Amino acid sequence: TRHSEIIKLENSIRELHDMFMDMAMLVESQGEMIDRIEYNVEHAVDYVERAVSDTKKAVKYQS
Amino acid sequence: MFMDMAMLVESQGEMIDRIEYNVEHAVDYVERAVSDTKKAVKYQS
Amino acid sequence: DAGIRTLVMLDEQGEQLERIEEGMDQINKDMKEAEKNLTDLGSGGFIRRVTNDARENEMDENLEQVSGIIGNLRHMALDMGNEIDTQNRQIDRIMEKADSNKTRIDEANQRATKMLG
Amino acid sequence: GMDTSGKQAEAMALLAEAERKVKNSQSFFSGLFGGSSKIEEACEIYARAANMFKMAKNWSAAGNAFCQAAQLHLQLQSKHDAATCFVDAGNAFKKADPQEAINCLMRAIEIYTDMGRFTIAAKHHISIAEIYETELVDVEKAIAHYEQSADYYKGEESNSSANKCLLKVAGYAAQLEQYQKAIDIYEQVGTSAMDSPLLKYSAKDYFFKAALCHFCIDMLNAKLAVQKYEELFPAFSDSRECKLMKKLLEAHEEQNVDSYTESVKEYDSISRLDQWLTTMLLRIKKT
Amino acid sequence: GMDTSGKQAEAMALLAEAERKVKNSKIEEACEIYARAANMFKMAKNWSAAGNAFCQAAQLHLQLQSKHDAATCFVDAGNAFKKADPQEAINCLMRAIEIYTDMGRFTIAAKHHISIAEIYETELVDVEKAIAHYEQSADYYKGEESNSSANKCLLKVAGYAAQLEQYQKAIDIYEQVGTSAMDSPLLKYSAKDYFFKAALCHFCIDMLNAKLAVQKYEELFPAFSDSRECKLMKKLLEAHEEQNVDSYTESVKEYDSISRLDQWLTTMLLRIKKT
Amino acid sequence: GMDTSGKQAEAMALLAEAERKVKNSIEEACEIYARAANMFKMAKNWSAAGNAFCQAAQLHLQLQSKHDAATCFVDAGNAFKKADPQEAINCLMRAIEIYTDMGRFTIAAKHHISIAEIYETELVDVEKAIAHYEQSADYYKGEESNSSANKCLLKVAGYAAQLEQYQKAIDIYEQVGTSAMDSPLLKYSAKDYFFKAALCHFCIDMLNAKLAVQKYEELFPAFSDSRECKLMKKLLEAHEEQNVDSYTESVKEYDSISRLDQWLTTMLLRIKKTIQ
């Protein structure tokens, strides 16, 4: 009975370990992607703001 | 290692919150621009 | 406790990710409409107790409890794991959308600046 | 270092130049009708001065410059950028002048909610409540702002965020010696959380806390609530919390305070206790 | 089934109408209607015809002044052809990759490179083509500071080379990635595996220098001693000193009771043991 | 393969075309130069690609462009990162200045962190790395990013305890422990920090270490029950008795229970050396 229970506990430990490294690697990739989109959206909003400001100034100059 | 993972999760949460706030600002401004364009086209036409 | 906190924080992250995806879709639709309009404008024991004694009992009991807790943890962990995959996919899918949006607006501006002269 | 003196001097010069520019703007408008370009240029200079002051670590000057820019641009019929500058002033004065930050955030809330942007108003309300609780002991203001933010988020159908605010309000209320609200809020959150696979595991904790909150009212209702929680959420019976409450109730039934404190000490040794639970248990033990 | 025939007939009719309209300024409308027809095929799920229509519409759009739309149509055509002649999908995806790279968008190009390598390796037997594509994608990702994607590609190529009996590149990549992970505060948990694999591969070369390799790994990473892999491998080496079959079989059976070994690991262990 | 020579020649031709176009005297020249730099990057010619990016950024900035100029400068710095760390650092500094002028403190702080990392890993300089990390920490604290600030402060304290005087280390470690005590999830780790603080005080003097560890034990009740507190008390007894054997035995026992970071080993070596 000692062998069975110890082996089962160690197998659970191994499953936990491998799953947690897999999920940690995926979480690192997700965090990098989120950091990327942060600057992506910042650049997008800044550029659209600048373009619409250019449109406003141009139309007001013409009228 | 559990304790270490918790901090990564928290960092992801906070950066997600910041990104969401920026997106809210962007969408609000886009909506305002759409309204202004509609007003301009309707009145000029 | 760390496991539970991890679960709740991941759930919050997923909800916010869904909300930002909805915002991106609305932004894309509004931008397309505006561009079009503007263009149209134009277990029995754990250790053999060699001397019996209470000590050999207590440790065994402790181990029992440990094992049980670990058991629970396993399943909980797996559940927590599932979420990430979905979130990841969603994130990737929004990337493209946003990028396209940006590109579009860029070219749109250039267009609006090339017919003038 | 050079940063302090250099930034102070250059920011003072830039602010004086902006002041002179705005002083001459009236004459320029009267004599030529230049429009609003001068005012926009002055606002840009003021924002630059605020940025330099922020880098200069002089938070008060940066906040004042942001407030001036917000006022001047609000005079220009641009409420969005005025609200942006007001939020900047609120988050700059937060540490230097808490009251000034409070009114700045209130003005930003008013301007935003005028447009129906309830999420930003709720975030500002949460910020105000957090500042009130952290700095001041005015619990009532924090609770009011938390409730308003929770209502705002509920109106947006954004679940999982109003729950935490309601839980915080209920805990602080229970600390304020009002238990009916705390019992109701904890029970509501628990019943909202049972069906969730992810949160179900934490649900038991909520139940436990609620049962402890009902302990002060009277022993009989405490036993009844223990029975109701055990029957409605059978999984809760597995947790050590039920055993702990049963032992505590048994100890109280015979005025056996010694067993009560022994059990509390053993549980604390197993896992360190929190201030709220410690205070609740000590207050109960007085009887 | 009635549904399949109905969808096929609807989409064929839409393509016929699109052809009539384009045959009759007109370029934009023709491209739009052709895109709609390709989508109608894809919904009808005629993979060959759907892909053919997709690439034809993409070419017509290429005739029109646009780049992003061309790339989107190309990736759609590649996805459609995924279940058709692999050569056409590979060609279209290569063209899309070239267009993206010329625009400076290296990340999506690397993703498409990974996809084409994956399809080439899984469908056909030629592994070297997938190895080359994966290496190109890894180099691009490394140039873009993408450590994770480069790490994954390096691991895959090292494993493939080890399977192909070119153990030198496998051990080099394994050691480099292991030391890189060791340098970072995180990723240490996996380093052991890399080291172990490297050792095994070098053991395939000989036995006398395997002792030196494991001693180097140990002195480089003392904690590696605690790994059960080290105990298994040292017992295997000690048994290998004598031409006895029982010892290493017993060691591997005892280790295997906990977790099942992967196909590659078992096939390498049998290869080393049998000779 | 044909890639190397073909892309190199095409980049030379594009550079010559841009030079001729500017000689006529404009965005077309900047676009051509950017494409040439990208092709150089493809050809693995990391060098002279950062130069092309810098030239394009200067040309585009001449007409008041700042966003794309900053992005291209950062890209040039990244390109030179491996080829020439110093010029990459200079480009990153220029980008940081531009961003700070615009007020993007997050980008400036991230670039400061990158500068400190490159300084510490490739070059040998701790003062520059410490200064840049502290600047990034101040920038982020202006942005109220607590986690990044705590990590940077931990790095600064580690460097200071490794080489600098222990006063900075004790101050930062005490601040970090006090901040972490209130956090429910992060409270348990505070013990570690406290232990480190005690070690630093022992590196200064034994009496200071004993007084500080007693004060911490009063401050942090769990610290009393921590194995670190018991080990520290036993070590203090051994050092006070000038008994090195107790020191070695306790260190071996602690190693048996748990491994050593190789930093605690250095501090313990320093403490053992002064037993005399």
XYZ file of C-alpha atoms in Angstrom, chain D:
287
model
C 21.249 67.916 -8.265
C 21.100 70.068 -11.382
C 17.590 68.729 -12.022
C 15.966 70.633 -9.153
C 17.350 74.111 -9.820
C 17.384 73.827 -13.610
C 13.825 72.545 -13.894
C 12.559 75.111 -11.388
C 14.189 78.011 -13.241
C 13.164 76.889 -16.729
C 9.605 76.089 -15.614
C 9.312 79.505 -13.959
C 10.533 81.188 -17.145
C 8.119 79.183 -19.306
C 5.187 79.884 -16.971
C 5.994 83.607 -16.977
C 6.156 83.547 -20.778
C 2.766 81.811 -20.906
C 1.333 84.382 -18.492
C 2.608 87.222 -20.685
C 1.224 85.495 -23.786
C -2.242 85.151 -22.256
C -2.041 88.761 -21.042
C -1.318 89.964 -24.589
C -3.912 87.609 -26.102
C -6.725 89.945 -25.037
C -5.103 92.869 -26.853
C -4.393 90.723 -29.914
C -8.018 89.565 -30.079
C -9.365 93.088 -29.559
C -7.127 94.673 -32.192
C -7.019 91.934 -34.836
C -9.381 89.079 -33.828
C -6.695 86.411 -34.019
C -9.193 83.765 -32.919
C -8.265 80.944 -30.536
C -4.810 80.028 -31.878
C -3.115 82.146 -29.205
C -5.155 80.497 -26.445
C -4.285 77.031 -27.765
C -0.586 77.940 -27.902
C -0.764 79.252 -24.330
C -2.496 76.035 -23.241
C 0.301 74.029 -24.861
C 2.879 76.083 -22.955
C 0.972 75.561 -19.697
C 0.793 71.802 -20.277
C 4.538 71.805 -20.948
C 5.096 73.712 -17.699
C 2.994 71.151 -15.833
C 5.036 68.324 -17.367
C 8.324 69.964 -16.359
C 7.034 70.548 -12.824
C 6.015 66.885 -12.646
C 9.540 65.928 -13.702
C 10.831 68.523 -11.215
C 9.045 66.668 -8.356
C 7.128 69.873 -7.517
C 3.720 68.217 -7.600
C 1.830 71.298 -6.407
C 3.038 73.492 -9.274
C 2.317 70.800 -11.871
C -1.190 70.322 -10.493
C -1.836 74.066 -10.475
C -0.614 74.356 -14.068
C -2.869 71.464 -15.088
C -5.828 73.130 -13.359
C -5.127 76.412 -15.147
C -4.883 74.614 -18.492
C -8.137 72.764 -17.792
C -9.948 76.005 -16.972
C -8.544 77.845 -19.989
C -9.401 75.053 -22.431
C -12.868 74.643 -20.906
C -13.328 78.326 -21.711
C -12.588 77.239 -25.309
C -15.653 74.919 -25.421
C -13.419 71.803 -25.463
C -14.819 69.835 -22.534
C -13.005 66.582 -23.369
C -9.476 67.977 -23.124
C -10.570 70.070 -20.139
C -11.666 66.859 -18.402
C -8.367 65.225 -19.366
C -6.454 68.085 -17.739
C -8.752 67.925 -14.704
C -8.001 64.214 -14.267
C -4.292 64.980 -14.632
C -4.637 67.612 -11.903
C -6.528 65.167 -9.690
C -3.882 62.465 -10.013
C -1.086 65.008 -9.555
C -2.543 66.770 -6.498
C -3.540 63.373 -5.057
C -0.326 63.224 -3.007
C 0.401 66.953 -2.633
C -3.072 68.430 -2.003
C -5.641 65.664 -1.416
C -8.578 68.083 -1.186
C -7.665 69.773 -4.472
C -7.390 66.357 -6.116
C -10.805 65.500 -4.671
C -12.519 68.485 -6.268
C -10.601 67.978 -9.528
C -11.782 64.366 -9.719
C -15.322 65.478 -8.867
C -15.252 67.976 -11.745
C -13.904 65.293 -14.083
C -16.708 62.975 -12.941
C -19.299 65.661 -13.640
C -17.912 66.414 -17.104
C -17.667 62.737 -18.063
C -21.080 61.711 -16.720
C -22.568 64.627 -18.654
C -21.647 62.555 -21.730
C -22.904 59.276 -20.250
C -19.423 57.737 -19.945
C -20.364 55.809 -16.822
C -17.240 53.624 -16.716
C -14.859 56.570 -16.314
C -17.160 58.152 -13.729
C -17.212 54.877 -11.788
C -13.416 54.630 -11.951
C -13.096 58.178 -10.626
C -15.595 57.378 -7.859
C -13.548 54.308 -6.911
C -10.413 56.455 -6.850
C -12.134 58.979 -4.574
C -13.342 56.224 -2.236
C -9.875 54.666 -2.125
C -8.262 58.013 -1.306
C -10.872 58.726 1.371
C -10.324 55.361 3.054
C -6.523 55.372 2.801
C -6.016 58.954 4.005
C -9.111 59.926 5.996
C -11.132 57.874 8.468
C -14.408 59.158 6.941
C -15.784 55.682 6.325
C -19.163 57.046 5.219
C -17.766 58.894 2.192
C -15.823 55.818 1.088
C -18.935 53.643 1.420
C -21.058 56.147 -0.510
C -18.569 56.362 -3.372
C -18.141 52.574 -3.428
C -21.910 52.080 -3.618
C -22.209 54.650 -6.404
C -19.418 52.959 -8.375
C -21.007 49.540 -7.853
C -24.337 50.887 -9.115
C -22.608 52.440 -12.128
C -20.918 49.148 -13.003
C -24.130 47.173 -12.453
C -25.858 49.511 -14.895
C -23.095 48.598 -17.347
C -23.730 44.869 -16.704
C -20.034 44.478 -15.801
C -20.216 41.705 -13.220
C -17.297 40.502 -11.063
C -16.418 44.165 -10.306
C -19.474 45.331 -8.369
C -19.155 42.178 -6.254
C -15.764 43.198 -4.856
C -16.980 46.722 -4.081
C -20.059 45.349 -2.315
C -17.873 42.925 -0.348
C -15.568 45.756 0.735
C -18.550 47.879 1.768
C -20.051 44.969 3.707
C -16.786 44.250 5.509
C -16.285 47.878 6.490
C -19.923 48.077 7.595
C -19.520 44.970 9.757
C -16.464 46.679 11.220
C -18.784 49.648 11.883
C -21.009 47.356 14.007
C -23.846 47.017 11.463
C -24.243 43.310 10.719
C -27.547 42.959 8.842
C -26.101 44.692 5.780
C -22.924 42.616 6.010
C -24.876 39.367 6.372
C -27.097 40.216 3.408
C -24.224 41.276 1.150
C -22.082 38.244 1.988
C -25.028 35.890 1.458
C -25.866 37.550 -1.865
C -22.277 37.270 -3.095
C -22.087 33.651 -1.960
C -25.308 32.701 -3.732
C -24.074 34.512 -6.840
C -20.767 32.607 -6.626
C -21.953 29.022 -6.025
C -22.903 28.397 -9.651
C -19.486 29.582 -10.847
C -17.050 26.636 -11.110
C -14.043 28.932 -10.710
C -15.310 30.974 -7.749
C -17.190 28.073 -6.125
C -14.040 27.064 -4.244
C -13.830 30.519 -2.661
C -17.601 30.587 -2.043
C -17.175 28.539 1.135
C -14.979 31.281 2.601
C -17.743 33.837 2.044
C -20.261 31.545 3.726
C -17.911 31.105 6.697
C -17.454 34.853 7.113
C -21.214 35.426 6.924
C -21.819 32.763 9.576
C -19.267 34.469 11.818
C -20.944 37.839 11.231
C -24.268 36.372 12.394
C -22.581 34.962 15.517
C -22.769 38.254 17.434
C -26.530 38.652 16.954
C -27.420 35.548 18.968
C -26.347 31.933 19.348
C -29.642 30.388 18.234
C -29.706 32.175 14.878
C -26.023 31.302 14.490
C -26.827 27.598 14.836
C -29.792 27.965 12.482
C -27.659 29.730 9.863
C -24.995 27.032 10.196
C -27.683 24.446 9.464
C -29.005 26.415 6.482
C -25.537 26.845 4.974
C -24.726 23.160 5.486
C -27.978 22.073 3.821
C -27.889 24.577 0.929
C -24.171 24.160 0.101
C -23.371 20.581 1.141
C -19.783 20.848 -0.091
C -19.262 23.511 2.584
C -19.635 20.743 5.175
C -16.339 19.224 4.027
C -14.333 22.330 4.934
C -12.763 22.706 8.370
C -14.833 25.876 8.845
C -17.908 23.876 9.870
C -15.869 21.908 12.406
C -14.398 25.136 13.779
C -17.806 26.774 14.183
C -19.211 23.633 15.806
C -16.346 23.491 18.304
C -16.718 27.204 19.074
C -20.470 26.832 19.610
C -19.893 23.809 21.850
C -17.345 25.783 23.877
C -19.783 28.677 24.283
C -22.666 26.370 25.247
C -20.893 25.476 28.513
C -19.107 28.805 29.098
C -15.929 26.862 28.261
C -13.897 29.857 27.128
C -10.624 27.958 27.582
C -11.538 25.449 24.869
C -12.626 28.368 22.677
C -9.234 30.065 22.954
C -7.337 26.776 22.572
C -9.173 26.061 19.318
C -8.597 29.615 18.080
C -4.884 29.395 18.910
C -4.521 26.025 17.183
C -6.221 27.308 14.034
C -4.042 30.435 14.093
C -0.953 28.234 14.378
C -2.145 26.206 11.386
C -2.753 29.435 9.443
C -2.129 33.016 10.549
C -5.314 34.996 11.182
C -6.479 38.318 9.736
C -7.180 41.509 11.675
C -10.906 41.487 10.857
C -11.399 37.876 11.942
C -9.237 38.431 15.023
C -11.329 41.441 16.064
C -14.600 39.603 15.413
C -13.493 36.585 17.450
C -12.206 38.750 20.305
C -15.449 40.749 20.399
C -17.459 37.516 20.471
C -15.235 36.152 23.248
C -16.186 39.062 25.524
C -19.522 37.348 26.211
